């Protein structure tokens with residue numbers, strides 16, 4: 278199609294490897310570019326950790342209010358929110374919001390611990406039918422994004438389907454689903470990524486990711502005014518270990534997708 282030719286041209290212009298999956302929930306149509314190739318998830322994995330904890334809270338009704346101590350030893354490389362509560366506590370709700378809306382790495386590690394390790398996050402993915410997602414490491418090493426390394430990867434197709442199920446489907450309870458959507462809509466890190474390629478009138482909930490090899494990711498649910506919502510995943514990685522982020526590539530991919538509607 279035209280869209281796939283334009284995405285291929287964008288990729289060629291960028292010097293990297295681009296993965297895109299769009300699900301149009303109107304007719305359940307899909308648009309895929311390298312849809313079944315593995316990409317490093319980096320912080321887009323935080324959606325799965327938060328959702329797994331939300332799933333736990335369906336049975337443990339008070340779980341999200343559980344206080345969790347933030348100790349200096351817990352701090353890793355990027356802890357914008359956890360830093361504000363060292364030697365204090367954050368609830369699991371506050372940690373989930375920090376992981377999602379600020380991409381706090383300490384928060385992510387506390388969510389992983391709550392789930393019994395990376396295998397507990399992966400287990401949740403399997404439980405909702407995602408056979409592709411794999412979380413192998415904690416923060417910060419899950420962002421190494423080494424070419425060919427299958428650790429901490431998924432495919433665009435798999436992530437799109439899973440994000441659809443978590444936000445628009447019923448993989449989560451009604452209150453949990455609404456909470457996740459609210460959190461994603463309140464993301465603070467996404468202004469230059471998918472959001473920047475879309476009409477300003479559309480409502481977006483997204484989770485960005487960045488890592489080594491210039492890995493620049495964004496996964497989003499999109500609510501166009503007067504139109505069925507869309508799920509869009511954009512993954513991008515580069516051949517140089519110290520490559521710079523390229524959020525403009527994700528904005529451009531979103532713009533190309535939006536034009537084709």
Ligand SMILES: *[B@@]1([O])O[C][C]([C][O])O1
Pocket residue numbers: 319320321354355380382417420485486487488
């Ligand atoms: B994710 O990718 O978003 C930011 C942090 C930086 O380590 O991880």
